Each structure stands twice: as structure tokens, then as C-alpha cells.
Amino acid sequence: MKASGTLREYKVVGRCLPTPKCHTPPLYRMRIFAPNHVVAKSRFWYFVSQLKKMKKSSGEIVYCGQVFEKSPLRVKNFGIWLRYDSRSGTHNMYREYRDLTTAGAVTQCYRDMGARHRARAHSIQIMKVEEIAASKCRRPAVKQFHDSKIKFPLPHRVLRRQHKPRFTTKRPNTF
Amino acid sequence: GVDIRHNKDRKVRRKEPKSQDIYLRLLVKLYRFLARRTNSTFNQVVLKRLFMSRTNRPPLSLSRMIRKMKLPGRENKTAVVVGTITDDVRVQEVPKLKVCALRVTSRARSRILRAGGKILTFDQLALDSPKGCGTVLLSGPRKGREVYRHFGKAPGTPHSHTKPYVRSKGRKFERARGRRASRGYKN
Amino acid sequence: EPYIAWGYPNLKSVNELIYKRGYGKINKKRIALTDNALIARSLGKYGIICMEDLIHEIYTVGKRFKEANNFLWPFKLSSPRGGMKKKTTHFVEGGDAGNREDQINRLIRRMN
Amino acid sequence: KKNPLKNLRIMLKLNPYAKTMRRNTILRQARNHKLRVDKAAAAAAALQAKS
Amino acid sequence: AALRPLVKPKIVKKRTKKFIRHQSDRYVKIKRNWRKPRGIDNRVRRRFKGQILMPNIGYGSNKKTKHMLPSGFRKFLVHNVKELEVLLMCNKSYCAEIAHNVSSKNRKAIVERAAQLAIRVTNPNARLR
Amino acid sequence: KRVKENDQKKKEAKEKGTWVQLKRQPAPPREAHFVRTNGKEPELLEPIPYEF
RNA sequence: UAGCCCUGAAAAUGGAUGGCGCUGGAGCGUCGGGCCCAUACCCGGCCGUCGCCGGCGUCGAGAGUGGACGGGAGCGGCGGCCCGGAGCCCCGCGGACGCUACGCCGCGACGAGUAGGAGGGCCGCUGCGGUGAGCCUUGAAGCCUAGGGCGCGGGCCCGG
RNA sequence: AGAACUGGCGCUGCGGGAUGAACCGAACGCCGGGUUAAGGCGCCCGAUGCCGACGCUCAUCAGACCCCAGAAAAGGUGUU
Numbered sequence A: 001m002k003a004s005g006t007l008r009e010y011k012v013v014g015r016c017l018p019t020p021k022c023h024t025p026p027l028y029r030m031r032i033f034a035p036n037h038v039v040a041k042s043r044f045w046y047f048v049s050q051l052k053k054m055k056k057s058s059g060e061i062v063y064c065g066q067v068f069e070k071s072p073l074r075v076k077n078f079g080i081w082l083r084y085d086s087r088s089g090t091h092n093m094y095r096e097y098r099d100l101t102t103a104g105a106v107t108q109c110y111r112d113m114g115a116r117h118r119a120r121a122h123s124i125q126i127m128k129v130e131e132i133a134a135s136k137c138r139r140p141a142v143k144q145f146h147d148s149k150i151k152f153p154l155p156h157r158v159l160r161r162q163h164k165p166r167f168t169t170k171r172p173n174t175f
Numbered sequence B: 001g002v003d004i005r006h007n008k009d010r011k012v013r014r015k016e017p018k019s020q021d022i023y024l025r026l027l028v029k030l031y032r033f034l035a036r037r038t039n040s041t042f043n044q045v046v047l048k049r050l051f052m053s054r055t056n057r058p059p060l061s062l063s064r065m066i067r068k069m070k071l072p073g074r075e076n077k078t079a080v081v082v083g084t085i086t087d088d089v090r091v092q093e094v095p096k097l098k099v100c101a102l103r104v105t106s107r108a109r110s111r112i113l114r115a116g117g118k119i120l121t122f123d124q125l126a127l128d129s130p131k132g133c134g135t136v137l138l139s140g141p142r143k144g145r146e147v148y149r150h151f152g153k154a155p156g157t158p159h160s161h162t163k164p165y166v167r168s169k170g171r172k173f174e175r176a177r178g179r180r181a182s183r184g185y186k187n
Numbered sequence C: 001e002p003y004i005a006w007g008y009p010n011l012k013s014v015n016e017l018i019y020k021r022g023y024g025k026i027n028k029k030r031i032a033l034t035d036n037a038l039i040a041r042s043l044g045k046y047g048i049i050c051m052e053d054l055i056h057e058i059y060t061v062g063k064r065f066k067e068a069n070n071f072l073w074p075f076k077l078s079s080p081r082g083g084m085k086k087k088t089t090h091f092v093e094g095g096d097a098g099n100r101e102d103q104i105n106r107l108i109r110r111m112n
Numbered sequence D: 001k002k003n004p005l006k007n008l009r010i011m012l013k014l015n016p017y018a019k020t021m022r023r024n025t026i027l028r029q030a031r032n033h034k035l036r037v038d039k040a041a042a043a044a045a046a047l048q049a050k051s
Numbered sequence E: 001a002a003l004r005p006l007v008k009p010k011i012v013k014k015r016t017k018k019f020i021r022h023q024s025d026r027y028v029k030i031k032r033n034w035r036k037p038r039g040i041d042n043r044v045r046r047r048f049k050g051q052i053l054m055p056n057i058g059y060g061s062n063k064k065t066k067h068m069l070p071s072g073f074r075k076f077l078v079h080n081v082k083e084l085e086v087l088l089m090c091n092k093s094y095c096a097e098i099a100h101n102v103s104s105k106n107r108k109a110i111v112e113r114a115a116q117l118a119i120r121v122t123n124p125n126a127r128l129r
Numbered sequence F: 001k002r003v004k005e006n007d008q009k010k011k012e013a014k015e016k017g018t019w020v021q022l023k024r025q026p027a028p029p030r031e032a033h034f035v036r037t038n039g040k041e042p043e044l045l046e047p048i049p050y051e052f
Numbered sequence G: 001u002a003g004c005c006c007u008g009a010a011a012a013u014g015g016a017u018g019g020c021g022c023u024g025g026a027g028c029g030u031c032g033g034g035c036c037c038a039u040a041c042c043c044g045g046c047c048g049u050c051g052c053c054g055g056c057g058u059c060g061a062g063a064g065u066g067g068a069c070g071g072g073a074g075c076g077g078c079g080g081c082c083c084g085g086a087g088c089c090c091c092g093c094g095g096a097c098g099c100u101a102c103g104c105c106g107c108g109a110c111g112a113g114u115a116g117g118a119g120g121g122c123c124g125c126u127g128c129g130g131u132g133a134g135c136c137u138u139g140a141a142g143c144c145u146a147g148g149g150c151g152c153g154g155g156c157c158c159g160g
Numbered sequence H: 001a002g003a004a005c006u007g008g009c010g011c012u013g014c015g016g017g018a019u020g021a022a023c024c025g026a027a028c029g030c031c032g033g034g035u036u037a038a039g040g041c042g043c044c045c046g047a048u049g050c051c052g053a054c055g056c057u058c059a060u061c062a063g064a065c066c067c068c069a070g071a072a073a074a075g076g077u078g079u080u
């Protein structure tokens, strides 16, 4: 999987074909984060085959719709659970972020386990993602934003090189 | 690029005859004018038999002709053969069949005309029939040569029938081991 | 599927390919079809004599689709002008070589 | 081979219906341009006449 | 600008640079006529870049522009009068040349004749007095 | 056997008046079926944590 | 417990992320939009080979995918005092190019290649039989050439 | 040194890998336009001269793109 750009949460349901042995299969439901609806129903046949005795040729999916949240304006605090495969062994990991949407959260996880653990986009598996409200977030860089009357300046500002005169006569004041 | 073929894309058949015979070149120019204008096939079969080599136009004998014309349905048709008609002597009686060919021999065209036949070439055939309607087209035994009986599997393995090349068919020439089981082995 | 890119088109991306990159065959010799008579003279045996009745069989794959698709010369599409991504990994794995199901309607327009 | 959908009357040599497929879809995206801008001013002139 | 021939297309020639033999730059035991390199290792047959091109069929000029002089006529060398009156019916598409063997007496003879018959000759003022 | 139920099944459709299309076809793609979620709702599943 | 950096960590002419260099990146990891080019792909031109062809209808009198005459019955359209009928052209005596049939002309697809095999060569050298009412002291062969050309090329021609 | 399957160099250029038989693209008549492939976008060198986005890392031997041209056990209150 590439995680190309920001992701997009999909809610995919699917079932295996009705055999003469068994009618009415249970028609499982998952929650897949993917850049488009082709990868979403192609990670869906990876997590189902880990958990049931099913695969793509004996099954199908019957709904691949994007679910998108009830608050793209209210700021949220998410605690997620991972299953990354490291170089030495594998692990289990809880991890917190804080952004407007789960499209901006689990993308922010994928752009960071690649940073702080070198975990490429195919190893890491998402278990469950639910928000947790204020003063339950243990992770300290979240903990400093449970703070009303919050403030800080913009120290040491620099931007837009080469854009102006290439050889100006003006030393750039950083405010 | 396109593919990985081994090329047969150049066809290898005859398109203009390798003989510088100016009379056959006046019969190609007649027939390939009539091959693409007839909207039929009898010219286009004659037109490619004027291309063929000296071997593949074998000499049709007289008695193959007067046997294949005695079938029910060939009673007054004018037999056409591309190649030379040589007379046989093994038959005794020659009917008044009408033929049309290049180069009937001197003795055959006596024996056709004395019994009241008529011989033709391929220029008074076109006037008689541009379609070539009402004819039978014949050809001699193209595998009749002594060359073709040298050709088979190999003159050494089982069921040969291949006539191996010796300089004289006789005793102590290719008859000692390979031909009899008492000396060496038998093929 | 390591070497191809196959998906399911919709109707105007089958309507542009026939009109712009469609080429017919009579016996051999790929011709510009460019008429209603270059189709019906060689394929009016099947009742799909005109242009849009040909494109109706190729979309709703119906009666004479083997006889209709083998009439068409293979569509010689130009190089994709928007770009591609990595060319050798699957379209699941970020690349573009395989089953993509409706993103091929984007890609037909870039190939043409 | 002149390109269909880049000159007209090569569409009409090959698909003769596609002229009257077109002046249905130049009317109905002109009269529905009329239908919007008349109504988008109708809630804009009613809000204006209040002041 | 004498006799104004017929139709001239704008002459394209694919090359004006006269294929030289490989390694004719280094020696004078090698004349500059082309012979193709049938060595096994050399990098002209193997066609590396930045080197001498070798002639193949792609450089052949257009069929209505082949053997065309830049004037627009086509040369055809004659030797006396009686083969210059073969060229009366081609006096606007084909032109005459007088061969070097033809002496200046005869070359003075067939330069008035090619003005009556209105043919361009390409060397009228040669070996004159 | 499939020629022998293509002989008597040929003449059975011959006196019946149709164009039965006895020739067998390969496995066609799945036509648009229609599922039922009677009363209850799909059971959510998600990958298990790692254990040895 | 594992990511980075450090220790572990020594080799002989002066030396290698290719180099100069690089530290709010020109390093590492995950990604986006742009943008640059191969003899690759697409469109167009031109050459050649191959595949299926097209014309001896120069028939300006030729036109046929049904053609003729022909009498026994009726339709319009011909010309009236409601009956009904050949015109072989002519006031122009007229209408380009072309089919070396071994030549043209059309469409279409492909093009790399040693060893090797074919086909082509109006490329070349020396002689012979024919042929050019050829060539020349009013200057041949040869050779030279910062002279002008042609051929894709083997090579050729003209001026000096 | 010896094999099996298939591809490839030998017989084969070109783009990229600084350079190279064999890697990664891709196969070649001569050309003008357009676009991409593998790759790249400080300057040699065509192109980020984007107000590119998110985190990590300081070396007194930094690190810096398949084959590929230098490395391990073990250790650190160096830092997340």
C-alpha cells in the first residue's frame, strides 16, 4: 500500500458466496483507511483472510462507501492501536494524535511511523481508531494542548527565498 | 518492435516466369489479362501453370488422357493440359478427342489428327472460351521422376524403400551389412 | 496482470476510442474506418451496419461481440501525457499494472 | 482521417443523430442558465428591496 | 534563368555531407570512397554515437526530386546533332550536356542547334575562342 | 453423455419450435444479485493484536 | 524494547556520496503538485522491402450490379381540330497525360544484426562478337584540382 | 567447478546506473512536432528559482538510492 496523499476512511461490508451447505453468510463489516476505493477493497481482502477462512474468489463485497465524520470542524483527540512489523521482531503500539478528522489522523500516523520507526507503508496495520475526549490523553505532546487560554508567539520567522530580488540589498529581518 | 516470428512473410512462389521464352511471355500477357477479368478460376489455374518450372510441368502421356476422358461426364469436352503431350504406344486405338496444349509431339499429332481429332494451343483456346468453360484441365505425373524415388525417410532405417545412390546396380555394391542379417545387421 | 492494465470503461470513453483511435480491417490492411459504408459492406451480415450500432455491441456485450471486436484493429493509444506511477508495481501497491475497475476511465483520456 | 468531435459533419457523416443530440444540449444548458440566473437574482432582488 | 523548366518541388535531400570511409582521416592509403566496415570490434558498424554515420536506405531522396539538378532540369550527355534531336520532345524536363570529347568545332555546331530546338545545354561557353 | 443429451434434447426442441442454444457456455460473470440484512446488522471485525 | 547518531573500526603514491560541496537539508523516512529527455510510444512527410491488388475501355462515344427486341392490353408525357410518335449528333468535325506490361498506379503493415545465405546493381577493371553513318591534333588516354554537380551508395559526369 | 527452468549479453545500438558485456527501462530506415518509461529536479547539467507538507538526526571517520565496490557481535543518562 502507498498511502499516497491523505487517506480516506471507507466502510466496507462483504460476504462469501452462498454454498448449498450454507445459505445466509454473516456478511462481515470493516473499516479500511485507503487512498481510493480500489486499495480499500484490496486491504479488505487482507484483514478478512487473517481473521476468517475467506478469500476473494469465494467472496465479494456488497458495499464500498466512504464514511466521513460528523465533525470536520470540531477539534478531536484520537487514540489508535497499531500492529507494526519491525526489523527485529514485531510489536504492538498505542499512539495519539490530534487533528480535525481521521483522514488527517491516520495519515498523520503513517507519515510519522515512517519517521520515528522507519516503518514503511505496507508493514503497519491499524486495529481500531476511536476518539477519546479531554484529560484521558496520556501522550505528553497531546497533554500540553488540553489548555484553554493557550498562547505562544511566532519566533524566528523565515520564508520565500529566491522569490524576491535574487541579489537584494536588504538583510531579512526575522521580526 | 512487434513480435518474435521466424519470417515466412516473404512468399516464395513464382510471379514472373524465369524463362526468357518470348512466346511464353506472349501467353502470360494474354492470361494475366484474363485472370483478373474473368471473375472465375480456370484462367487463374492456367495462369499459374504457365509459371511453373520444367519439372513441375511433367510430360503427360496420351494414354493417361484417353483414360481420364472416358469417365461418365467427359464425353465431348475439350481436354486442356499445360505441358507437352507425348504419345504412348501401349494403347492401340485413339478416339477423336480434342485437345489444347503447348507442344504436342510430332508422332502424337499425327495419331490425333489421323483419327479425326483436333489439337490446339492457348491462343485459339481464348477465342473459343475466355472462361475456359466446358474443359477438363489435366496434368501429368509430377512425382514420376526417378529423383522422387530417392526421397523418403533415409536409406538405412527400418522400412526404407529409398533406393540408395550407387554407381552400378550389381553384386558387391551396397549389399553386405545393412541388407542381410547373416553379415552384420538388417535394416 | 504484471504487464497489462485492465479496468471497466464507461460509455464516453468507449465512445472516444472508436471515434478517434478506431481502425478497421477488411481482409488485412488496417484502414481508417471514417464512414458508415466501410463498416456495413464488410460487417452488415450481423445487423450492426452503422457506427453507433457497432458501439452498442461493444458496450452491452451482446450478440456478435467476437465478430465485432475482431473487426477492430487493436487501439494504438499514445503515451500517457499526465504521467504514470512506477509502472511495475500493482495499482493496489501504488503502481499502475493491473485491475483498477473504474480509474481506467481517467487513464483512457490520458492515453488519447 | 479528420477527427470526429473536433470538426462537425464528420460526426454527421457517421452518426447523423448527433446533430440533434447537440441542439438539445445547447438549448437545455442555455434555458437552465436562464432558469438559475433569473432565480438567483430573484432571491437577490428580494433581499435587496428589503433595504 | 534561361529556359524556365516545369514543376520544381522544394528540393529536400536528407543529407548534403557525402559519406566518407571510416579512418580515411588518418591516412592517404585509404581513399575517401565508401567501403563498409566488416570488422568485428569496431564502433562504426556497432553504431555508437558521435561518430560517422553509415548509409542505409533511409537517406534516399524523393522520387520526383531524384537526379534533379538545382536548376530544375535533368542532365543527359550527347555527342553530336543526330542524338540531340532525340531531345526535342523533352526540351522542358530534360537537358543536354556536351561530353568533354566533343571538340570545340562540333561544340560550336551543337550550341546553335540546341538554341533552335530550345534545349538548355549546361556548358555552352566551354573550350571557346 | 453430453452428446447424448444433445441428440434427444435437440429433437425435443425441434418439435417445440425454438432456438434453444444447446451449446454450453463458460462460467459467466456474477449478475447483479441482491442481499438481505434481515433485522440484524453486520458484525464488525478488526485485526487481533500481536501475541507469540 | 527499537529508530536514528556515536563506540567497536587498522594498511601501505595523495583521494573519493562522481565532484565541488552540503547541516530551517543538497542527510534519513513517508508523501503531493509541477517540470526535463531515449533511436520507446502517437501524428505527419519521405525511402525501401513484403503482403492483396488496379489498367491493353485511348470505348469522346464509352458507360453494363439484369439486357434485348416484338408483335396481343392499358399509364402519364409528347405535338387536337379527341384520333396520335426515331431524331444515323451537330452552329463549333471537337475533348490533356498515359500501358518500357520486365513498365506504371493505389492502399496497408513492418524496418537492428556478426557467422551465414539469397536477390538486386543504368557500379567498376581487362578482352571478344555485335551495335552507335560514335569520338577526336580545332587535342584522345592518364594525372592534378580551393571548379560545378548527381547518386543512399559502389561510382559517374561537366569546367579548368 | 558443475546443473535445472526462463530471460539476457555473444549478434544489439539508445536512455539511466559518474565510469562498465551481462543491471533497470527499451529494442534502431531518415526526419519535424507532442508525450512518457527507468530515472531525476543546489551548481557542473535539462528540470522544484514549489511561500512543497510531516517528523527524525550533529559526526574531533556524519550520512547520502537494486546488483554495487567496505562490516558484525556487543554497548551508550547522545535523542525521540
Ligand SMILES: [Mg+2]
Pocket: E040, E041
Ligand atoms: Mg563481438
Ligand SMILES: [Mg+2]
Pocket: none
Ligand atoms: Mg555477413
